[PDB]
Amino acid sequence: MGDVSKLSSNQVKLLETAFRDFETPEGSGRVSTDQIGIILEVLGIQQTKSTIRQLIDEFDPFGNGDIDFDSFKIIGARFLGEEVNPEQMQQELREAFRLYDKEGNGYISTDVMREILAELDETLSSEDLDAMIDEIDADGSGTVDFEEFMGVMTGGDE
């Protein structure tokens, strides 16, 4: 809960960038607790100073005035949770290629693309599948991978 290893370097970038931005009283190497309530706003996590007093009371019990990156990192790690990925349970077809890749190319051949269509749309006859195959592979690369599959499965029929 909080942790430091729970933080991906992506998030630490934002942390580190804002850390140094409001950092230091006169060259301390840490970021002032008066700035913590600011950065927590810059990072869109914690609340105004009333809440920040908890943070300071917790991470700076020593009354130093400013907290090091590790202390701030724990702060970030417990509040950030900026993990809102667009490929979350979406465009899964990428990893599903190897799932359906009987042939072993990393890309699914037009043969496997056929059987995939038939499964989802059992209205496509064997010949229809072949035409779909033609229609699917937009790049004419021969194997269905990139915009072929993303365009046939997640293309937007309507």
Side-chain angles (χ1 to χ4, degrees):
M1 180 57 178
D3 290 89
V4 288
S5 42
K6 261 58 181 296
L7 268 184
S8 178
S9 303
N10 294 32
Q11 327 182 269
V12 182
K13 258 67 181 186
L14 284 71
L15 294 180
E16 168 80 75
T17 307
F19 181 87
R20 306 301 178 164
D21 197 80
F22 307 88
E23 177 208 73
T24 228
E26 196 194 311
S28 184
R30 298 78 164 125
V31 65
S32 178
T33 51
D34 296 285
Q35 302 300 273
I36 298 179
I38 309 183
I39 310 176
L40 271 30
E41 176 174 61
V42 326
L43 303 169
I45 32 173
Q46 225 46 209
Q47 294 168 87
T48 190
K49 297 190 183 65
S50 305
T51 295
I52 307 300
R53 288 296 304 164
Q54 316 292 329
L55 288 293
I56 303 165
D57 176 88
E58 166 166 28
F59 288 91
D60 185 15
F62 306 94
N64 185 268
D66 46 277
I67 64 169
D68 53 74
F69 201 49
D70 182 64
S71 310
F72 174 72
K73 186 187 297 180
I74 304 176
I75 295 177
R78 73 188 299 194
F79 300 137
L80 263 290
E82 61 173 280
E83 175 173 70
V84 193
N85 201 88
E87 301 80 49
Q88 73 181 332
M89 70 172 298
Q90 302 196 331
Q91 282 185 90
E92 300 177 281
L93 302 324
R94 282 291 178 198
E95 300 185 76
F97 294 139
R98 299 177 299 244
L99 200 62
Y100 291 102
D101 181 26
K102 291 85 181 295
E103 306 294 274
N105 306 273
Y107 324 123
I108 57 158
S109 302
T110 53
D111 288 292
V112 48
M113 177 81 281
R114 271 178 184 163
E115 60 180 279
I116 294 181
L117 311 158
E119 173 60 58
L120 280 299
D121 280 281
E122 47 175 285
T123 53
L124 279 291
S125 303
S126 55
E127 299 293 88
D128 289 86
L129 295 175
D130 177 71
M132 270 201 167
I133 292 307
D134 188 64
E135 192 168 275
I136 290 163
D137 175 17
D139 189 86
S141 197
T143 49
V144 181
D145 177 76
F146 29 113
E147 301 198 284
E148 310 80 68
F149 201 100
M150 309 315 308
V152 60
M153 193 284 187
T154 50
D157 306 64
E158 302 175 274

